[model samples]
Target: VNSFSGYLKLTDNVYIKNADIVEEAKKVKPTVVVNAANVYLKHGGGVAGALNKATNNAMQVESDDYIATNGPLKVGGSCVLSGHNLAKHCLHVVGPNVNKGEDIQLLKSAYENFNQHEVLLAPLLSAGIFGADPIHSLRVCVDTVRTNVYLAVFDKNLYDKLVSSFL
Candidate 1:
C-alpha cells in the first residue's frame, strides 16, 4: 500500500485527525510546552548549523514578542533559567546530540505544571539537524505535541505550508 494509505490506516487506529487533536489539546490546555530539533551533522555542521541556530533564535525572539505584545507580561530568554520567578512557565529544548529520552521529561513537566499565567515554550530543531530531514523533523514535532498548547518549528517555508494546508 502507498504511504498515505498506510498513514490513513494508522491514523484511523490512532485518531490523528486535526479536529480530534485539537479537542484533546483543549482537554489538557497546557500552560507551557517544550520542543526542540537538531541542525548539526558531521557533513553539514558549520555555517548551515549556525544559520539554522540563528534562525531558530530569531524565531524564538519573535515568538517572545508575540507573547509580550498580547499577554499581560513580557517574557525573555532569561525565563528559561532556573530560580527565576517567571510570570510564565519556561520551556527549553536542547540541541544536537540530545535525544528524546533526555528532554521529553522536561516537556512533560512543563505541560503538567502549566498555570493560567504561564506561557508554553519550546525550541524546535529545524531540517538538517541531528540526522533529521525536513519532513522528518516536522513529523516528529507533529507527533510529539499533537495535543499541546504551543510548538515552535524552524523554517518559515515549512511553517507557511503547514498552516496553509490546515487553513
Candidate 2:
C-alpha cells in the first residue's frame, strides 16, 4: 500500500500530504512530530495514541512527568519532549475544545507554536474530537506556520478535499 496518497504545495517549503502521520514522520525524519495532546497531555487514542504506541509508551511516561511538574497544559499551549523512536522530538500541543465552545484562535496558536523546528510533521489539529472544521484547520496551518512543514493527513475525505482545494 502507498504510504502517501496525495500532495499539495503551499509556499516555499510547506506542503500537505495524505498519509498516516506516524508513517510520514518515519519517512520525513522531521525535527519534531506534532501530537494533538489534551490539556492533561494524555496519549489517548488518535494521533497521540498512535505516536505513543510507536514509541513504546515513552511519550506517555514523559508526558506524565511533564504534567506532574508543569501542571496541565492550557489550551493553545505546547510542550516539547523527546520523540523516543520517531523524530528528534515530539511537540505536544493542546488545542481548543470547540465542542465546549472554544474558538479557532487556540488552534492557530497550537500550529504557530512549533515553527522553531526546521522540519515539522503535523496532522489537522483540533479537527478530530475537538470539532474544529478540517478545512479551517488546514487554512490555519497554512496561515500560521512558517517552516518546512508536511501536513500529514489520514482521512480519505479530507485528502480529497485538500486535493481539490489545492487544484
Candidate 3:
C-alpha cells in the first residue's frame, strides 16, 4: 500500500499530500477550503471549477454576489464565502496574472490573506493556470499559512517535487 502523506518537521501545522483536493476537502472537512479564481471570481475551471461543481454552483452564485457588492478582486486579493456542501466556508483568492511577469509577491499576498480557521485546506496557489512555479508556490504556501493546513497536490510528479523539496 502507498502512504499518502508526510509532515514537515519544521512546521507542525503543514501537511503535504498526494491527493485531489476537491475529494480531500470533503473528507478532511476543513473550516475553509481555498479556491484559485480570476479577478471576477468565476468558478469555471481549475480547482475553482471542481469545487464549484461539488457545491452545486453555490460557490459560483455567492462569488457573483460578492463581486457585485465588493467589486472585482485585485490580484493578491481574496474573500471568504459559504462552502455549501463541502467545507464550512470557501476562501476565494486571486493570484497574479502570470502574463504580467513573475509576481511572486502578489502570489504570496494571496496566500497571506487566508482566513484563520481551525483547519484550512489549500492547493498550491498561483501554480496551474496562474503559472507561478509549483515549487515556489509550495514554498510560499508553507511559509505563509499559520493555522492547521493540508497542502494537497494532485500529480505524482508534483507530490514528489514537494515532498523532496521540503521533507
TM-score of each: 0.32, 0.90, 0.87
List RMSD in Å for every model shown.
13.2, 3.2, 3.5
Each prediction's number of clashing residue pairs: 7, 0, 0
Tens-digit lDDT track of model 3 for 1-167: 12224534337666777777898777767678888878888888778898889988878888888889989988898888887877788888888868667477888788787645656778788887777788888788777878677777777787887777665
What order do candidates take by TM-score, descending?
2, 3, 1
Please give the lDDT score for candidate 1.
0.32
Deviation from native of the Cα of residue 105 in model 2, angstroms: 2.0
**Local accuracy of candidate 1 as per-residue lDDT tens digits, 61-140:** 54455446554221111123121122123333333332333343233322232233233433333333433344443445
Model 1 earns a TM-score of: 0.32
- Model 2 TM-score? 0.90
Best TM-score among the predictions, by candidate number: 2
